[PDB]
Amino acid sequence: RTAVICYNGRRYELETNLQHRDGSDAAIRTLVLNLMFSINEGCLLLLALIPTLLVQGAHDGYVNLLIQTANCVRETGQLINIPPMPRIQDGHRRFPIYETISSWISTSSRLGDTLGTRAILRVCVFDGPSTVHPGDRTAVIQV
Amino acid sequence: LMGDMAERTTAILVSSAPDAGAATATTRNMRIYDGALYHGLIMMAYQA
């Protein structure tokens, strides 16, 4: 704006509306900020493995499905290149990949709890029925 | 026909891999070899 769902084999349609333009950008800024605090120095060594992930997606089965949805990794791995990385400043001491994948889980354990809502309860039916159809009371326990 | 000659008949061995419809990352090491005589000839029953 500023520029169907399947579940258990059943489709639904959304009726979500945008009646103004302030909350849209209050969410866009958070999306872009959290999308911007993920990139780091060690990310380039992960970026050089795209031609190798492309061959492991042809050698394996689980990776060949992961590569289809990656609408970027599937396009860069045959269209862009990178020369080898420079020598790590004080490389005898530190480790960049540990940094780039330690400071990556934080900004992902928050992306849900900021673009949406947290989880407050979870269904624990000790002796009641197993599943719950629309309109039937459950037994929950707060998180 | 002395301006269009034919020096010798030779032997060809064209190598190739299977087509897209039979491709894996495992059958590409299973090359196909084919032979064709160049300027050779095919005979009827041999008089001999």
Coordinates of all heavy atoms in Angstrom, one line a residue, chain A residues 39-108:
Chain A
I39 N 22.4 -7.6 9.4 CA 23.6 -7.7 8.6 C 24.8 -7.3 9.4 O 24.8 -6.3 10.2 CB 23.4 -6.7 7.4 CG1 22.0 -6.8 6.8 CG2 24.4 -7.2 6.3 CD1 21.7 -5.6 5.9
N40 N 25.9 -8.1 9.2 CA 27.1 -7.9 10.0 C 28.3 -8.3 9.1 O 28.1 -8.6 8.0 CB 27.0 -8.6 11.3 CG 26.6 -7.8 12.5 OD1 26.8 -6.6 12.5 ND2 25.9 -8.4 13.4
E41 N 29.5 -8.2 9.7 CA 30.7 -8.5 9.0 C 30.7 -10.0 8.6 O 31.0 -10.3 7.4 CB 31.9 -8.2 9.8 CG 33.2 -8.8 9.2 CD 34.4 -8.8 10.2 OE1 34.3 -8.0 11.1 OE2 35.3 -9.6 10.0
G42 N 30.4 -10.9 9.5 CA 30.4 -12.3 9.2 C 29.4 -12.8 8.2 O 29.4 -13.9 7.8
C43 N 28.5 -11.9 7.8 CA 27.4 -12.3 6.8 C 28.0 -12.6 5.5 O 27.4 -13.4 4.7 CB 26.4 -11.3 6.7 SG 24.9 -11.8 5.8
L44 N 29.2 -12.1 5.1 CA 29.7 -12.3 3.8 C 30.2 -13.7 3.6 O 30.1 -14.3 2.5 CB 30.9 -11.3 3.5 CG 31.2 -11.2 2.0 CD1 30.0 -11.1 1.2 CD2 32.1 -10.0 1.8
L45 N 30.7 -14.3 4.7 CA 31.1 -15.7 4.6 C 29.9 -16.6 4.4 O 30.1 -17.7 3.8 CB 31.9 -16.1 5.8 CG 32.7 -17.5 5.7 CD1 34.1 -17.4 6.3 CD2 31.9 -18.6 6.4
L46 N 28.8 -16.3 5.0 CA 27.5 -17.0 4.6 C 27.1 -16.7 3.2 O 26.4 -17.5 2.6 CB 26.4 -16.6 5.6 CG 26.6 -17.1 7.0 CD1 26.0 -16.1 8.0 CD2 25.8 -18.4 7.1
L47 N 27.4 -15.5 2.7 CA 27.1 -15.1 1.3 C 27.9 -15.8 0.3 O 27.4 -15.9 -0.9 CB 27.2 -13.6 1.2 CG 26.0 -12.8 1.7 CD1 26.4 -11.4 2.2 CD2 24.9 -12.8 0.7
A48 N 29.1 -16.3 0.6 CA 29.9 -17.0 -0.4 C 29.4 -18.5 -0.6 O 29.9 -19.1 -1.5 CB 31.3 -17.0 0.0
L49 N 28.6 -19.0 0.3 CA 28.1 -20.4 0.3 C 26.9 -20.6 -0.6 O 26.4 -21.7 -0.8 CB 27.8 -20.9 1.7 CG 29.1 -21.3 2.5 CD1 28.8 -21.3 4.0 CD2 29.5 -22.7 2.0
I50 N 26.4 -19.5 -1.3 CA 25.3 -19.7 -2.1 C 25.6 -20.6 -3.3 O 24.7 -21.5 -3.6 CB 24.7 -18.3 -2.6 CG1 24.7 -17.3 -1.3 CG2 23.4 -18.4 -3.2 CD1 24.2 -16.0 -1.7
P51 N 26.7 -20.4 -4.0 CA 27.0 -21.4 -5.1 C 27.1 -22.9 -4.6 O 26.9 -23.8 -5.3 CB 28.3 -20.9 -5.7 CG 28.8 -20.0 -4.7 CD 27.7 -19.4 -4.1
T52 N 27.5 -23.0 -3.3 CA 27.6 -24.4 -2.7 C 26.2 -24.9 -2.2 O 25.9 -26.1 -2.4 CB 28.6 -24.3 -1.6 OG1 29.8 -23.7 -2.0 CG2 28.9 -25.8 -1.1
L53 N 25.4 -24.0 -1.7 CA 24.0 -24.4 -1.4 C 23.3 -24.7 -2.6 O 22.4 -25.6 -2.6 CB 23.3 -23.3 -0.6 CG 23.3 -23.5 0.9 CD1 24.7 -23.7 1.5 CD2 22.7 -22.2 1.6
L54 N 23.6 -24.1 -3.8 CA 22.9 -24.5 -5.0 C 23.3 -25.9 -5.5 O 22.5 -26.6 -6.1 CB 23.2 -23.5 -6.1 CG 22.2 -22.3 -6.3 CD1 20.9 -22.9 -6.8 CD2 22.0 -21.6 -5.0
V55 N 24.5 -26.4 -5.1 CA 24.8 -27.7 -5.5 C 24.4 -28.7 -4.5 O 24.0 -29.9 -4.8 CB 26.4 -27.9 -5.8 CG1 27.1 -28.0 -4.5 CG2 26.7 -29.1 -6.7
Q56 N 24.3 -28.3 -3.2 CA 23.7 -29.2 -2.2 C 22.2 -29.3 -2.4 O 21.6 -30.3 -1.9 CB 24.1 -28.8 -0.8 CG 25.5 -28.9 -0.5 CD 25.8 -28.8 1.0 OE1 25.3 -28.0 1.7 NE2 26.7 -29.7 1.4
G57 N 21.5 -28.3 -3.0 CA 20.1 -28.5 -3.3 C 19.9 -29.4 -4.5 O 18.7 -29.8 -4.7
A58 N 20.9 -29.7 -5.3 CA 20.8 -30.7 -6.3 C 21.3 -32.1 -5.9 O 20.9 -33.1 -6.5 CB 21.6 -30.3 -7.6
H59 N 22.1 -32.1 -4.9 CA 22.6 -33.4 -4.3 C 21.6 -33.9 -3.2 O 21.7 -35.1 -2.9 CB 24.0 -33.2 -3.7 CG 25.1 -33.5 -4.6 ND1 25.6 -32.6 -5.5 CD2 25.8 -34.7 -4.8 CE1 26.6 -33.2 -6.2 NE2 26.7 -34.4 -5.8
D60 N 20.8 -33.1 -2.7 CA 19.9 -33.5 -1.5 C 18.5 -33.3 -1.9 O 18.1 -32.7 -2.9 CB 20.3 -32.8 -0.3 CG 20.2 -33.6 1.0 OD1 19.9 -34.8 0.8 OD2 20.3 -33.1 2.1
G61 N 17.6 -33.7 -0.9 CA 16.2 -33.6 -1.1 C 15.5 -32.5 -0.3 O 14.7 -31.8 -0.7
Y62 N 16.0 -32.4 1.0 CA 15.4 -31.4 1.9 C 15.9 -30.0 1.5 O 15.1 -29.0 1.7 CB 15.9 -31.6 3.3 CG 15.2 -30.7 4.3 CD1 13.9 -30.3 4.2 CD2 16.0 -30.2 5.4 CE1 13.3 -29.5 5.2 CE2 15.4 -29.4 6.3 CZ 14.1 -29.0 6.2 OH 13.5 -28.2 7.1
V63 N 17.0 -29.8 0.8 CA 17.5 -28.5 0.5 C 16.8 -28.0 -0.8 O 16.7 -26.8 -1.1 CB 19.0 -28.5 0.4 CG1 19.5 -27.1 0.0 CG2 19.6 -28.9 1.7
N64 N 16.4 -29.0 -1.7 CA 15.8 -28.6 -2.9 C 14.4 -28.0 -2.8 O 14.0 -27.3 -3.7 CB 15.7 -29.8 -3.8 CG 15.6 -29.4 -5.3 OD1 14.6 -29.2 -5.9 ND2 16.8 -29.3 -5.9
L65 N 13.8 -28.2 -1.6 CA 12.5 -27.5 -1.3 C 12.8 -26.1 -0.7 O 12.1 -25.1 -0.9 CB 11.6 -28.3 -0.4 CG 10.2 -27.7 -0.1 CD1 9.6 -27.1 -1.3 CD2 9.4 -28.8 0.5
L66 N 13.8 -26.1 0.2 CA 14.2 -24.8 0.8 C 14.7 -23.8 -0.2 O 14.5 -22.6 0.0 CB 15.3 -25.0 1.9 CG 14.9 -25.5 3.2 CD1 16.1 -25.6 4.1 CD2 13.8 -24.6 3.8
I67 N 15.3 -24.2 -1.3 CA 15.8 -23.3 -2.3 C 14.8 -22.8 -3.2 O 15.0 -21.7 -3.9 CB 16.9 -23.9 -3.2 CG1 16.4 -25.2 -3.8 CG2 18.2 -24.2 -2.5 CD1 17.2 -25.7 -5.0
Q68 N 13.6 -23.4 -3.3 CA 12.5 -22.9 -4.2 C 11.9 -21.7 -3.6 O 11.6 -20.7 -4.3 CB 11.5 -24.0 -4.4 CG 10.6 -23.8 -5.6 CD 11.2 -24.5 -6.8 OE1 12.1 -25.4 -6.7 NE2 10.7 -24.2 -8.0
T69 N 11.6 -21.7 -2.3 CA 11.0 -20.6 -1.7 C 11.9 -19.4 -1.5 O 11.4 -18.2 -1.5 CB 10.4 -21.0 -0.3 OG1 11.5 -21.1 0.6 CG2 9.7 -22.3 -0.4
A70 N 13.2 -19.6 -1.5 CA 14.1 -18.5 -1.3 C 14.2 -17.7 -2.6 O 15.1 -17.9 -3.4 CB 15.5 -19.0 -0.9
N71 N 13.3 -16.7 -2.7 CA 13.2 -16.0 -4.0 C 14.4 -15.1 -4.2 O 14.4 -14.4 -5.2 CB 11.9 -15.1 -4.0 CG 10.7 -15.9 -4.4 OD1 9.7 -16.0 -3.7 ND2 10.8 -16.5 -5.6
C72 N 15.4 -15.1 -3.3 CA 16.6 -14.3 -3.5 C 17.8 -15.2 -3.6 O 18.6 -15.1 -4.6 CB 16.8 -13.4 -2.3 SG 15.5 -12.2 -2.1
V73 N 18.0 -16.2 -2.7 CA 19.1 -17.1 -2.8 C 19.1 -17.9 -4.1 O 20.2 -18.2 -4.7 CB 19.1 -18.0 -1.6 CG1 20.2 -19.1 -1.7 CG2 19.3 -17.2 -0.3
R74 N 17.9 -18.2 -4.6 CA 17.8 -18.9 -5.9 C 18.2 -18.0 -7.1 O 18.4 -18.6 -8.1 CB 16.4 -19.4 -6.0 CG 15.4 -18.4 -6.5 CD 14.0 -19.0 -6.5 NE 13.0 -18.2 -7.2 CZ 11.8 -18.6 -7.6 NH1 11.4 -19.8 -7.3 NH2 11.0 -17.8 -8.3
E75 N 18.1 -16.7 -6.9 CA 18.5 -15.8 -8.0 C 19.9 -15.2 -7.9 O 20.5 -15.0 -9.0 CB 17.5 -14.6 -8.0 CG 16.1 -15.0 -8.5 CD 16.0 -15.2 -10.0 OE1 16.9 -14.7 -10.7 OE2 15.0 -15.8 -10.5
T76 N 20.4 -15.0 -6.7 CA 21.8 -14.5 -6.6 C 22.8 -15.6 -6.9 O 23.8 -15.4 -7.6 CB 22.0 -14.0 -5.2 OG1 21.2 -12.8 -5.0 CG2 23.4 -13.6 -5.0
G77 N 22.5 -16.8 -6.5 CA 23.4 -17.9 -6.7 C 23.8 -18.2 -8.1 O 24.7 -19.0 -8.3
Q78 N 23.2 -17.6 -9.1 CA 23.5 -17.8 -10.5 C 23.7 -16.5 -11.2 O 23.9 -16.4 -12.4 CB 22.4 -18.6 -11.2 CG 21.2 -17.8 -11.6 CD 20.0 -18.7 -11.8 OE1 20.1 -19.9 -11.9 NE2 18.8 -18.0 -11.8
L79 N 23.7 -15.3 -10.5 CA 23.8 -14.0 -11.1 C 24.7 -13.0 -10.5 O 25.0 -12.0 -11.1 CB 22.4 -13.4 -11.1 CG 21.4 -13.9 -12.2 CD1 20.0 -13.7 -11.9 CD2 21.8 -13.1 -13.5
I80 N 25.3 -13.3 -9.3 CA 26.2 -12.4 -8.6 C 27.4 -13.2 -8.1 O 27.3 -14.4 -8.0 CB 25.5 -11.7 -7.4 CG1 24.1 -11.3 -7.8 CG2 26.3 -10.4 -7.0 CD1 23.9 -10.1 -8.7
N81 N 28.5 -12.5 -7.9 CA 29.7 -13.1 -7.4 C 30.3 -12.2 -6.4 O 30.0 -11.0 -6.2 CB 30.7 -13.3 -8.6 CG 32.0 -13.8 -8.2 OD1 32.9 -13.1 -7.6 ND2 32.3 -15.1 -8.5
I82 N 31.3 -12.8 -5.6 CA 32.0 -12.0 -4.6 C 33.4 -12.5 -4.6 O 33.7 -13.7 -4.7 CB 31.3 -12.2 -3.2 CG1 32.0 -11.3 -2.1 CG2 31.3 -13.6 -2.7 CD1 32.0 -9.8 -2.4
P83 N 34.4 -11.6 -4.5 CA 35.8 -12.0 -4.3 C 36.0 -12.4 -2.9 O 35.2 -12.1 -2.0 CB 36.6 -10.8 -4.7 CG 35.7 -9.9 -5.5 CD 34.3 -10.2 -4.9
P84 N 37.1 -13.2 -2.6 CA 37.3 -13.6 -1.2 C 37.4 -12.5 -0.3 O 37.7 -11.3 -0.6 CB 38.7 -14.3 -1.3 CG 38.8 -14.8 -2.7 CD 38.1 -13.8 -3.6
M85 N 37.0 -12.8 1.0 CA 36.9 -11.8 2.0 C 38.3 -11.3 2.5 O 39.3 -12.0 2.3 CB 36.1 -12.3 3.2 CG 34.7 -12.6 3.0 SD 34.4 -13.8 1.7 CE 35.1 -15.3 2.4
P86 N 38.3 -10.0 3.0 CA 39.6 -9.5 3.5 C 40.0 -10.2 4.8 O 39.2 -10.9 5.5 CB 39.3 -8.0 3.8 CG 38.1 -7.7 2.9 CD 37.3 -9.0 3.0
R87 N 41.2 -10.1 5.2 CA 41.7 -10.7 6.4 C 41.1 -10.1 7.6 O 41.0 -8.8 7.7 CB 43.2 -10.7 6.5 CG 43.8 -9.3 6.4 CD 45.3 -9.3 6.6 NE 45.7 -9.9 7.9 CZ 46.7 -10.8 8.1 NH1 47.5 -11.1 7.0 NH2 47.0 -11.3 9.3
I88 N 40.6 -10.9 8.6 CA 39.9 -10.4 9.7 C 40.8 -9.6 10.6 O 41.9 -10.0 11.0 CB 39.3 -11.6 10.5 CG1 38.4 -12.4 9.6 CG2 38.5 -11.1 11.7 CD1 38.0 -13.8 10.2
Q89 N 40.3 -8.4 10.9 CA 41.0 -7.5 11.8 C 41.1 -8.1 13.2 O 40.0 -8.4 13.8 CB 40.3 -6.1 11.9 CG 41.2 -5.0 12.4 CD 40.4 -3.7 12.7 OE1 39.4 -3.4 12.1 NE2 40.9 -3.0 13.8
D90 N 42.3 -8.4 13.7 CA 42.5 -9.1 14.9 C 41.9 -10.5 14.8 O 41.4 -11.1 15.8 CB 41.9 -8.4 16.1 CG 43.0 -7.4 16.8 OD1 44.1 -7.9 17.1 OD2 42.6 -6.2 17.0
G91 N 42.0 -11.1 13.7 CA 41.5 -12.4 13.4 C 42.0 -13.6 14.2 O 41.4 -14.6 14.3
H92 N 43.2 -13.4 14.8 CA 43.7 -14.4 15.7 C 42.9 -14.6 17.0 O 43.0 -15.6 17.7 CB 45.1 -14.1 16.1 CG 45.2 -13.1 17.2 ND1 45.3 -13.5 18.6 CD2 45.3 -11.8 17.3 CE1 45.4 -12.4 19.3 NE2 45.4 -11.4 18.6
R93 N 42.0 -13.6 17.3 CA 41.3 -13.5 18.5 C 39.8 -13.7 18.5 O 39.2 -14.5 19.2 CB 41.6 -12.1 19.1 CG 41.1 -11.9 20.5 CD 41.1 -10.5 20.8 NE 40.3 -9.7 19.9 CZ 40.4 -8.4 19.6 NH1 41.4 -7.7 20.2 NH2 39.7 -7.8 18.7
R94 N 39.1 -13.1 17.5 CA 37.7 -13.0 17.5 C 37.1 -14.0 16.4 O 37.9 -14.5 15.6 CB 37.2 -11.6 17.3 CG 37.8 -10.9 16.1 CD 37.2 -9.5 16.0 NE 35.9 -9.5 15.4 CZ 35.6 -9.2 14.1 NH1 36.6 -8.7 13.4 NH2 34.4 -9.2 13.7
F95 N 35.8 -14.1 16.4 CA 35.1 -15.0 15.5 C 33.9 -14.3 15.0 O 32.9 -14.1 15.8 CB 34.8 -16.3 16.2 CG 34.3 -17.4 15.3 CD1 34.8 -17.7 14.1 CD2 33.2 -18.2 15.8 CE1 34.4 -18.7 13.3 CE2 32.8 -19.2 15.0 CZ 33.3 -19.5 13.7
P96 N 33.8 -14.0 13.7 CA 32.7 -13.2 13.2 C 31.4 -13.9 13.1 O 30.3 -13.3 13.3 CB 33.2 -12.6 11.9 CG 34.6 -13.0 11.8 CD 34.8 -14.2 12.7
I97 N 31.4 -15.2 12.7 CA 30.2 -15.9 12.5 C 29.4 -16.1 13.8 O 28.2 -16.0 13.8 CB 30.4 -17.2 11.8 CG1 31.4 -17.1 10.6 CG2 29.1 -17.8 11.2 CD1 30.9 -16.1 9.5
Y98 N 30.1 -16.4 14.9 CA 29.5 -16.5 16.2 C 28.7 -15.2 16.5 O 27.6 -15.2 17.0 CB 30.5 -16.8 17.2 CG 30.0 -16.5 18.6 CD1 28.9 -17.2 19.2 CD2 30.7 -15.6 19.5 CE1 28.5 -16.9 20.4 CE2 30.3 -15.4 20.7 CZ 29.2 -16.0 21.2 OH 28.8 -15.8 22.5
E99 N 29.3 -14.0 16.1 CA 28.6 -12.8 16.4 C 27.4 -12.6 15.5 O 26.3 -12.3 15.9 CB 29.6 -11.6 16.1 CG 30.5 -11.3 17.2 CD 31.8 -10.6 16.8 OE1 31.8 -10.1 15.6 OE2 32.8 -10.6 17.5
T100 N 27.5 -12.9 14.2 CA 26.4 -12.7 13.3 C 25.3 -13.7 13.5 O 24.1 -13.4 13.0 CB 26.9 -12.8 11.8 OG1 25.8 -12.4 10.9 CG2 27.3 -14.2 11.4
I101 N 25.5 -14.9 14.1 CA 24.4 -15.8 14.4 C 24.1 -15.8 15.9 O 23.2 -16.6 16.3 CB 24.6 -17.2 13.9 CG1 25.8 -17.9 14.7 CG2 25.0 -17.2 12.4 CD1 26.0 -19.3 14.2
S102 N 24.8 -15.0 16.7 CA 24.3 -14.8 18.1 C 23.4 -13.6 18.1 O 22.3 -13.6 18.7 CB 25.5 -14.6 19.0 OG 25.1 -13.9 20.2
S103 N 23.8 -12.5 17.4 CA 22.9 -11.3 17.3 C 21.9 -11.4 16.3 O 21.3 -10.4 15.9 CB 23.8 -10.1 17.0 OG 24.4 -10.2 15.8
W104 N 21.6 -12.6 15.8 CA 20.6 -12.9 14.8 C 19.3 -13.5 15.5 O 18.2 -13.2 15.0 CB 21.0 -13.8 13.7 CG 20.0 -14.0 12.6 CD1 19.9 -13.3 11.5 CD2 18.9 -15.0 12.6 NE1 18.8 -13.8 10.7 CE2 18.2 -14.8 11.4 CE3 18.6 -16.0 13.5 CZ2 17.1 -15.6 11.1 CZ3 17.5 -16.8 13.2 CH2 16.8 -16.6 12.0
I105 N 19.5 -14.3 16.5 CA 18.4 -14.9 17.2 C 17.6 -13.9 17.9 O 16.3 -14.0 18.0 CB 18.8 -16.0 18.1 CG1 19.8 -16.9 17.3 CG2 17.7 -16.9 18.6 CD1 20.3 -18.1 18.2
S106 N 18.3 -12.9 18.5 CA 17.5 -11.8 19.2 C 16.5 -11.1 18.3 O 15.3 -11.1 18.6 CB 18.5 -10.8 19.8 OG 18.8 -9.8 18.8
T107 N 17.0 -10.6 17.2 CA 16.1 -9.9 16.3 C 15.1 -10.8 15.6 O 14.4 -10.3 14.7 CB 16.9 -9.1 15.3 OG1 16.0 -8.5 14.3 CG2 17.9 -10.0 14.6
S108 N 15.1 -12.1 15.9 CA 14.0 -13.0 15.4 C 13.1 -13.5 16.5 O 12.0 -13.9 16.2 CB 14.7 -14.2 14.7 OG 13.7 -14.9 14.0

